[PDB]
UniProtKB/Swiss-Prot annotation, chains A, D, E, F:
Plastid recorded as keyword: yes
This protein's name: B-phycoerythrin beta chain
GO cellular component, one term: chloroplast thylakoid membrane
UniProt-listed Gene3D superfamilies: Phycocyanins (1.10.490.20)
Organism superkingdom: Eukaryota
């Protein structure tokens, strides 16, 4: 939709201004961590199935009120929905890590997620705890501090992208709160 | 809009999957290409008033009919509207050098040109004469790099091909 | 592109390789349907010319797209074969739907849930149930775009209603499979001068078709009903309910308030010390990251968060059925109106000055990660 | 920068308040023990949805007449309101741990709450036990002596922060009684 | 849907009355200006492309806030829509001038125009100015007072049809206000 | 303040109160050696959850008849109620340590304990054995002579408060003799 | 199949337009990446018999219960079926290192795996025990270059995430 390149044109389209050398170096700075961004998305979708299955079962293991009958994640259909429901959030945050800004998931995934989960009857406080596990493991992979899985990388700093994906995962949490 | 990123992200979403190793491979070209086209953007933005002044009147030099009364250029202010009409086109090819695709040119300058230039009697052959006067005036040693002159000319003739 | 005679492509059912094209368009559905006599007549391939077949495919399948002359050349590819007879108009809207001009105004710009509801509006001309969504939302998860549009065109609901020669339209059939399915179809299909492009969130049928109860509002169904079937009830009676809805349907006033999410709050005079009813249920929404040296641990004030009424149905209804065997041995009658209550000192930790202790009595029960 | 935090928590005209990179160490130099105090709130708000679901269910399993007919946590209009009200106390006390002052807690959260709960018929016998669980739940997460979850931290003592929230939860226990 | 002959039959359907010689001569007068209405519709659709293109450019030339970026007629696609949006208004008032009553445009053009322009962000005060130019020009044609184009007619009275099309152009203005 | 602390205890309802730091130095001046005595309560109640879970577990290993079927700690309704009487001795001796008297220990707790243990079938010779472990546990905590958990302290002598709590624990045991 | 070329040439065709400057730029990424992955394919094709002998047996070292009677490993020949049944996967990682995308991995190895491995009672966990044993044994000095081992690991875990 809007990537990091097209975010600075719609700010400049309202001013009718040509993009010049005062903010092109801010955009040329974004290309300088091009390969730093590129390995970071590859480390996310490397362990993406083990990402969501540790996240939903961790939400179950601290709050075992959904497995009880009458719960939302009780039956075998709704757990298959809930493993799919957290998988779409991982799929669209990975688009925003590739696009560089929260604009693809905002109008597709988050637009109308709040009343979808209210009308179906999703416990919204448990959905905060669902994606907060997916926030703390997304920064665990792209800083490579994951204990059971260590991936080889070229050495350097990557903490600027760690504040990027952690600004996306609470945008999901604010859109569902 | 229609960039190289929005091409591969929407195609990975229309398949309904994660970003695969083809899609991470497509963005790796942009490190090799943004070093050439972004300095063509600031060469356009640092010289945008000259390339509308001494190239917007070349349509009037070729088409000297339309300053007659009863026609598309009547008075002095519609000529001032006309230099406003071509300044948006030079803004948009600056807006597509910074994106990397042809994204901001289509829905903002191209889509709907067959409607508004037919009802308001604006001759599109006088549009493309001013744009192709800018197209053949590129050269290596004065204007930009030898590589940026390929892609800056590669956006201008797409405006020629879509208007004609 | 394929052949000058092609009834069906892609070989989904086995009996389409032997299936002819329909020699004539299919008949109307045989129930009574009092509404459709006021409706305009359906447009088919073999009664009308290409000027109006293209307009009604734009008026129904494209919603109201405003396709320009340089816009949609993929439709101009698919229309140039339909005029040559190279594919039927059933297969033509499959080629319209799989094209990117349908994608770049309904798939990328609308939401994930709204893309299914617009597909039932365009292709089938109705609005789905929740089980029809839940079988269509998995094709967007596992198989993608092209298989999901195959679920409409190769369905038996399409081939009985339209067949190979009839342009899609709102089929009033009178006797429906559900009473909701009439009036959810009608709410999904307004008349002229409406499009789908401004409502990037649709947000009203996205929450009536979400839960299986809470059928939609009556003025949202009296609006697109036909004429001498609405009048003497839309002069000024429901007319202000229509205008107040249209300013809410336009700009997408999100129906947390009045449709679903239905909480009897206390009156404003009941608290009055936790006052200023704009700021009554607001909390600090705090978030920390603590990674490296780029954090932005930004505290926000949150909105008026409501009791969600289903996490309070997981809690307090499913579990907390632990009020069993509560005779609690009523021996020792002098206990001065309290149970076993420890004094509960609880020293607030002595950071050497300006930090002090207070105490509080409470009834104490031992937990379930306790003895043996 | 704390006046930017204090004006957004009394609901003035800002929508939210973001803290940058250079401002975050400027906030850490402002308050005392700025590395541990941001780790204490990060332990609280990551488990806020588990804590108020346990403390309400801890309140029910002590006094089971609340979900009897005639109780206050019967008719789940009310039970979702009580599950809301536990979160609002936890979200205001986690700000006061972050700010270091109870001054926001007394004027935004606690004045008239004794008058609100006698006007709503909320029983003060069980409402103190709702807070007294959440004092013990917050003080176990801070020194990392929770039974199930052991979260990784830089090692050291945090008992000066652990007695800080016990003073802050006692002000909730004072203003309700 | 409803023409002028079918308008009096639903006025007579509510009374269950045979339509007779007390109001057939009011409808015989409608056929007396049968050709006067018939030449009037032809003069609207004669210069129909020059009707709307002068009308929307007259709305632009008095208010250049739309050509400014952020305006609703800034880009090239929106000017192509706004040339076509006012053309449909001409296309349905020419239907209702032919049908003799405002019934064909009130349900195909006006039913749903208000919330489409609200959710798009169309300035409603500018479209009031846009169609009131078309009110002043449609009465300029059917009174033959157009200065740049005079058409030959049989001479006579036509101001009864002048208030007819002027009543239609305030019906499109009321439904958008 | 101590009369206000008397209003915490005797009210026959759940109540809570704290003391601010301006009011705290008046309380340290009113009591003698109060920095030991505020450390005396805080040594006990920070380890109270292990103190009652080891003393009544030590009662079982000296008298295994209570886990016989029909014995008084056989079911978990009775086992949780034995720890519920274990903690409520320990809070009421801690406030008696805090106030420095025993009058709140007799009037609020021990008046009516012999009349309610014989009526409930509670073994009084076994619960004296349970509280004598808690006499022996608390003198290790007050002299920092615990073998597992040793706490940091401002050094000095607090054997006067060691004899103060042993005069409080035998007053429990003489009340149920 | 689903390459970086056939992604951007089908999305240009579904839009119904010419290859624009966004589509021409995506092939410029293949100049910078084919030096890395085509060396990894020659390291895989020159060592394919080794990486199924001392890495296909590691599933049986993890799952010795499969060689029990009445299971998916009964006799000697189904184990000789099994090393062929793993060598077709390592041919397919070689078939997608030279494409650039996940094209030949999907419809030849993935699409339909949930059907044949469930009906014929084959445990997919013992597939991914053999595949991820090859994944963690990559290193820079012995095996390949430093960049080839990133991409060769990036196609293995896609097969783990598809089967699990
Ligand atoms: C097709 C697959 C494919 C990719 C996915 C990318 C991955 C990639 N990354 C780097 C190179 C690098 N990548 C990183 C990134 C990181 N290092 C870390 O320790 C962090 C964990 C992580 C950040 C989140 C760093 C720090 C460098 C070296 C500096 C740099 O070139 O950016 C390089 C070499 C660039 C050079 O040195 O010239 C390549 C080729 N490239 C590919 O061909
Ligand atoms: C009660 C049951 C219970 C669980 C199921 C787990 C679930 C779980 N895992 C983590 C925390 C984590 N989870 C992972 C995920 C993974 N680690 C890997 O190496 C794999 C690739 C992947 C799982 C397959 C990572 C990387 C962390 C961060 C800590 C770490 O590096 O181990 C957290 C903390 C989240 C947070 O800090 O906000 C939780 C709740 N923990 C529990 O207490
Ligand atoms: C970003 C686009 C861009 C341009 C194309 C030029 C456009 C341009 N060219 C000239 C001026 C000129 N331009 C040229 C052309 C050339 N000169 C050479 O050395 C090459 C052989 C050849 C490149 C095609 C020549 C020979 C003149 C001087 C004579 C003349 O005015 O025509 C002038 C007037 C004087 C000046 O400003 O230099 C302008 C505005 N400027 C711009 O900002
Ligand atoms: C996807 C691939 C694809 C194509 C290759 C074209 C192929 C094609 N062309 C036409 C249709 C046509 N094609 C031509 C073209 C020509 N006849 C001549 O005399 C010239 C030699 C030649 C132009 C250079 C003409 C004239 C028609 C219309 C036939 C008629 O009705 O008179 C049709 C039928 C649809 C229609 O009539 O509009 C199709 C499918 N269209 C496609 O969709
Ligand atoms: C297009 C983007 C897109 C999304 C953002 C998600 C959002 C989403 N979730 C569900 C649907 C659901 N989502 C959940 C998920 C959960 N409930 C819980 O208790 C957990 C907290 C959480 C899992 C982490 C459940 C249980 C259902 C099914 C409800 C039911 O019918 O019982 C539905 C309805 C379709 C269906 O029922 O399958 C949608 C649209 N799905 C999408 O397609
Ligand atoms: C952006 C957000 C942000 C945060 C979340 C914190 C995170 C954080 N904490 C510490 C650092 C620390 N954090 C703790 C805290 C604890 N250790 C324990 O054993 C207890 C369980 C817990 C008490 C609550 C301690 C003891 C240190 C070491 C510094 C010190 O002793 O004060 C550090 C510096 C060293 C390190 O990286 O570990 C950082 C960045 N700071 C931030 O800027
Ligand atoms: C105000 C101060 C105060 C107390 C001192 C206690 C006193 C006390 N204990 C019990 C009730 C009980 N007390 C015990 C305790 C014991 N039985 C044994 O075998 C052990 C010797 C000993 C634990 C160490 C048991 C087992 C019961 C429950 C008896 C039963 O359920 O039949 C009851 C009955 C009420 C109930 O529990 O429902 C009361 C008032 N409670 C108070 O509120
Ligand atoms: C019969 C009804 C009944 C209950 C519902 C529970 C309720 C309950 N939980 C805890 C106590 C606690 N509750 C939590 C909270 C959590 N622990 C986790 O590991 C999760 C992350 C998170 C949500 C479950 C913590 C951290 C403690 C303190 C240590 C512990 O017990 O784990 C306490 C002790 C509080 C105190 O001593 O004052 C009680 C009464 N116990 C009961 O007797
Ligand atoms: C500023 C801070 C702030 C708060 C503290 C809460 C305080 C609060 N609670 C309620 C309202 C309520 N609060 C409760 C809560 C409880 N009843 C019990 O039995 C438990 C002890 C307790 C939950 C733990 C209930 C049950 C209601 C609803 C009353 C009713 O419907 O009868 C209301 C009335 C308004 C409404 O609910 O719409 C308010 C202001 N809200 C705030 O904005
Ligand atoms: C298919 C094409 C076609 C038409 C468009 C109509 C036009 C038409 N108009 C009139 C005839 C007329 N038409 C007008 C109308 C007008 N004169 C004016 O000065 C006004 C500008 C304008 C009214 C808006 C008048 C005033 C007469 C003469 C009186 C009358 O016959 O109505 C007549 C002759 C009737 C007669 O005199 O007997 C015809 C044939 N008929 C057609 O066959
Ligand atoms: C064949 C003949 C025959 C017997 C000899 C008794 C044997 C006997 N006594 C008790 C059971 C018991 N016995 C006692 C008795 C005592 N505990 C004390 O602490 C006192 C000092 C002492 C009595 C003086 C108590 C308190 C119980 C448990 C009460 C109960 O089981 O209801 C039980 C357990 C029954 C059960 O599990 O419910 C049995 C089998 N019953 C018989 O059928
Ligand atoms: C039959 C089984 C069996 C037991 C359950 C224990 C029970 C037990 N514990 C202690 C004794 C004690 N128990 C504790 C309590 C604790 N220690 C800590 O550090 C924790 C905080 C806390 C729970 C583990 C302490 C501090 C002492 C004193 C240690 C000492 O005597 O030096 C004593 C000696 C006191 C006495 O006899 O009165 C006994 C019998 N011993 C047993 O033989
Ligand atoms: C706000 C809450 C609050 C507390 C938790 C306590 C904490 C506390 N205790 C002492 C201080 C002390 N505490 C003790 C007590 C002991 N020392 C030992 O080594 C024995 C194990 C134990 C006997 C029980 C002694 C002996 C002193 C020093 C003399 C005194 O000030 O009483 C001091 C003064 C330390 C100093 O300034 O240097 C403080 C703040 N006081 C408070 O105001
Ligand atoms: C196409 C990919 C490919 C591979 C990864 C290897 C895989 C591999 N490695 C070893 C053999 C070995 N592999 C290693 C591992 C390593 N050795 C080092 O220098 C690094 C530190 C570390 C890379 C992770 C070691 C130490 C041995 C010798 C000991 C052993 O046999 O395990 C063997 C058996 C004997 C041999 O042929 O060497 C095989 C098949 N071969 C391949 O064809």
């Amino acid at each position: 939709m809007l990537d990091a390149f097209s975010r600075v044109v719609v700010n400049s389209d309202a001013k009718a201004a040509y993009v010049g050398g005062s903010d092109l170096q801010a955009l040329k700075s974004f290309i300088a961590d091009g390969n730093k961004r590129l390995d970071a998305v590859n480390s996310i979708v490397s362990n993406a199935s083990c990402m969501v299955s540790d996240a939903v079962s961790g939400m179950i293991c601290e709050n075992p009120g959904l497995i009880s009958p009458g719960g939302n994640c009780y039956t075998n259909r709704r757990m298959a929905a809930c493993l799919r429901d957290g998988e779409i959030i991982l799929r669209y945050v990975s688009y925003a890590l590739l696009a560089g800004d929260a604009s693809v998931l905002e109008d597709r995934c988050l637009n109308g997620l709040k009343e979808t989960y209210i009308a179906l009857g999703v416990p919204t406080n448990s959905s905060i705890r669902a994606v907060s596990i997916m926030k703390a493991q997304a920064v665990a992979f792209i800083t490579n501090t994951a204990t059971e899985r260590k991936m080889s990388f070229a050495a350097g700093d990557c903490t600027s992208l760690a504040s990027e994906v952690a600004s996306y995962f609470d945008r999901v949490g604010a859109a569902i709160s | 809009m229609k960039s190289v990123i929005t091409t591969v992200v929407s195609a990975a979403d229309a398949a309904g999957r994660f970003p695969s190793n083809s899609d991470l491979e497509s963005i790796q070209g942009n490190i090799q290409r943004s070093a050439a086209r972004l300095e063509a953007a600031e060469k356009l933005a640092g010289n945008h008033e000259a390339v509308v002044k001494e190239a917007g009147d070349a349509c009037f030099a070729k088409y000297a009919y339309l300053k007659n009364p009863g026609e598309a250029g009547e008075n002095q202010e519609k000529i001032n509207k006309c230099y406003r009409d071509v300044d948006h086109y030079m803004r948009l090819v600056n807006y597509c050098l910074v994106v990397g695709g042809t994204g901001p040119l289509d829905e903002w300058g191209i889509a709907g040109a067959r409607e508004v230039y037919r009802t308001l009697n604006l001759p599109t052959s006088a549009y493309v004469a001013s744009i192709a006067y800018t197209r053949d005036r590129l050269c290596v040693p004065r204007d930009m790099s030898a590589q940026a002159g390929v892609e800056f000319s590669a956006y201008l003739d797409y405006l020629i091909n879509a208007l004609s | 592109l394929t052949l000058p005679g092609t009834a069906e492509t892609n070989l989904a059912v086995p009996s389409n390789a032997v299936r002819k094209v329909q020699p004539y368009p299919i008949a109307k559905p045989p129930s009574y349907s009092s509404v459709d006599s006021l409706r305009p007549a359906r447009v088919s391939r073999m009664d009308a010319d290409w000027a109006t077949i293209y307009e009604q495919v734009r008026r129904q399948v494209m919603g109201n797209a405003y396709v320009m002359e340089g816009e949609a050349p993929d439709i101009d590819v698919a229309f140039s074969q339909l005029k040559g007879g190279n594919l039927t108009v059933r297969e033509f809207v499959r080629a319209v739907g799989k094209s990117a001009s349908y994608r770049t105004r309904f798939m990328e710009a609308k939401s994930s849930y709204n893309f299914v509801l617009l597909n039932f509006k365009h292709f089938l001309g109705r609005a789905p149930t929740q089980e029809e969504v839940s079988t269509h939302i998995q094709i967007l998860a596992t198989s993608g775009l092209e298989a999901e549009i195959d679920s409409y065109i190769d369905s038996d609901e399409y081939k009985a209603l339209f067949g190979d020669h009839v342009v899609p339209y709102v089929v009033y059939r009178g006797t429906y499979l559900s009473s909701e399915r009439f009036n959810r179809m009608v709410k999904a299909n307004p008349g002229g001068a409406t499009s789908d492009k401004a409502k990037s969130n649709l947000n009203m049928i996205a929450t009536v078709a979400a839960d299986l109860p809470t059928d939609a509002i009556d003025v949202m169904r009296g609006l697109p009903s036909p004429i001498t079937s609405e009048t003497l009830a839309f002069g000024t009676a429901y007319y202000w309910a229509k205008v107040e809805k249209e300013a809410s349907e336009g700009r997408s006033a999100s129906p947390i308030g009045e449709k679903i999410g239905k909480f009897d709050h206390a009156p404003i005079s009941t608290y009055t010390s936790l006052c200023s009813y704009d700021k009554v249920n607001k909390a600090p929404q705090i978030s920390v990251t603590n990674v490296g040296s780029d954090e932005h641990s930004y505290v926000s004030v949150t909105s008026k968060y409501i009791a969600p009424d289903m996490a309070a149905a997981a809690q307090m209804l499913a579990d907390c059925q632990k009020y069993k065997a509560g005779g609690n041995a009523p021996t020792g009658k002098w206990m001065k109106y309290y149970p076993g209550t420890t004094v509960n000192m609880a020293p607030y930790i002595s950071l050497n000055d300006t930090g002090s202790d207070s105490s509080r009595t409470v009834s104490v029960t031992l937990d379930k990660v306790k003895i043996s």
